[PDB]
Design a protein around this ligand. Structure first.
Ligand code: NA
Ligand code: NA
Ligand code: NA
Ligand code: NA
Ligand code: NA
Ligand code: NA
Length: 122
């Protein structure tokens, strides 16, 4: 009950040669966040990820929630396919919606964590 909660589109579809601009939301029972530790990343590191290096995000406080803008410009030559990515949010007290251990276990087991989504390039 102390962890923040992301709502993100389960499948974010982007197209070669086009930009995109999707939104996710974070809520927390404390109403307060660590915006510097709220990120969009691939599994392995706090980075956008190989094959999706153009994936960008921004974090804004709106009232008691976070607005997470997920955006970028997809190069015309980008490789098509499907990638798993993550919105990892931190409340002001340092609680997270998903830990790296939870993320790693889900990736191996083919299960999911809060904030996980599929990024599909067409
Ligand atoms: Na909390
Ligand atoms: Na949801
Ligand atoms: Na839902
Ligand atoms: Na554009
Ligand atoms: Na709240
Ligand atoms: Na961390």
């Amino acid at each position: 009950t102390e962890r923040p909660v992301v709502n993100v589109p389960s499948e974010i579809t982007v197209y070669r040669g086009e930009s995109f601009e999707y939104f996710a939301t974070v809520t927390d029972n404390s109403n307060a966040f660590d915006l510097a530790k709220t990120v969009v990343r691939w599994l392995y590191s706090n980075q956008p990820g190989r094959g999706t290096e153009w994936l960008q995000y921004s974090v804004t406080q709106v009232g008691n929630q976070l607005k997470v803008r997920i955006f970028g410009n997809v190069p015309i030559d980008t490789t098509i396919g499907d990638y798993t990515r993550y919105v990892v949010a931190t409340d002001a007290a340092g609680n997270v919606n998903a830990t790296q251990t939870e993320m790693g276990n889900a990736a191996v087991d083919k299960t999911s964590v809060n904030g996980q989504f599929k990024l599909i390039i067409r």
